[PDB]
Subunit: 116 residues, 4 copies
Amino acid sequence: CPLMVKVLDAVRGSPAINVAVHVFRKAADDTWEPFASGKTSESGELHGLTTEEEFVEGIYKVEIDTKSYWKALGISPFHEHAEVVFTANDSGPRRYTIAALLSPYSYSTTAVVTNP
Amino acid sequence: CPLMVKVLDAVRGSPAINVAVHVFRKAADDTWEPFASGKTSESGELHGLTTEEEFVEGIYKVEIDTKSYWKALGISPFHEHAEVVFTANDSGPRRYTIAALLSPYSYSTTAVVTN
Amino acid sequence: CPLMVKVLDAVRGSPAINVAVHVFRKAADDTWEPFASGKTSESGELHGLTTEEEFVEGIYKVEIDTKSYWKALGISPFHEHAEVVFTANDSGPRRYTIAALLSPYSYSTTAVVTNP
Amino acid sequence: CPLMVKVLDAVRGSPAINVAVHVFRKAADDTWEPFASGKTSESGELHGLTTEEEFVEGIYKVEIDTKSYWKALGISPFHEHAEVVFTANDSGPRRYTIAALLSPYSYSTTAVVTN
């Protein structure tokens, strides 16, 4: 699949499991249209979100529900979620892995982009 | 000023100067409404965004224009911008410092809430 | 293998390839004895550093040569290397993945520790 | 003070207070020799480590005792400490700020070199 998300927990040193992830694509009206969604696995990974055919060029938004994750763990986090916004496939099909590292009051996100 | 933003450049190891920052407050209509904005100083900081009496509880979004920042440096960036969405509560501490560390294909943000 | 290292390049959004990695283990004399070494692959990964039998409890140091990596790229980095020091296997055998994200003047490192 | 250290706590979203910091300078014997040390203040900062005339070019190691920091908070940490090794050059800018963001199983460090 061309879009993968990987989430890690910096407090426990483990993959962030069952984290809700919603992806949106900017429409002509500049509004965010639902594109795909899923939950991270036991390895903190989410695959099968889309296909090369469906994943056309556009501006995408990957919203990771970090809040529900921390609350489920008995922690009141700072952020509502982690949002990664980017232009995808504007120079041909690419493979994207959006990685996120979570902490109650902090998060980092990196993008690994390779050719198909 | 109960809300401050600090941005750093991880490629050049310096404060990220002249980065546009927009703050929004979630309205009852669930839409985002402009609240405050400015550009980071020579030290990569942005203060005087709001006042204690205007900064009421609610959900705020701090949008940092990282794409323009990198493009002015002649560097190809991945993200359109960096967005930090959070609920400001009177329960916890008073001052909110939103810090961001920038790289072309990566960014981290941390909140320092003190009294 | 019980010890894996993964390195990513935050400037190019790609795995950090051919990065030299040296691992050391603290001896009785508190000196660092060479334990294992390798280079990251095209996926920015390094496996086969050791075995569950050789990877006994102790204090280990994983030194990632970030300097040679950036210099080879025509960049004069700030750090000499990235050093991750930790106690391993003190409560039984564990699997460790030391992940590092590199930038010329910054790096972050996270540890993912799972059971065998 | 040409060398400053700033430490933040990513779990509690606050400055990391009272963290022991040791600085070392590489001697010709390749061994590490004590140079300066102290503990972060209430704002998580450590200044007055050295002076411009004592801070000559060379390889320095800034060792942050993160393990003790977490243990005092009753949190199990992964790292023994955080070590930042770098060469100080007169060529580039004057002031060196070593910033570190701490989490129990993760830490990031950034260098802000300014004039």
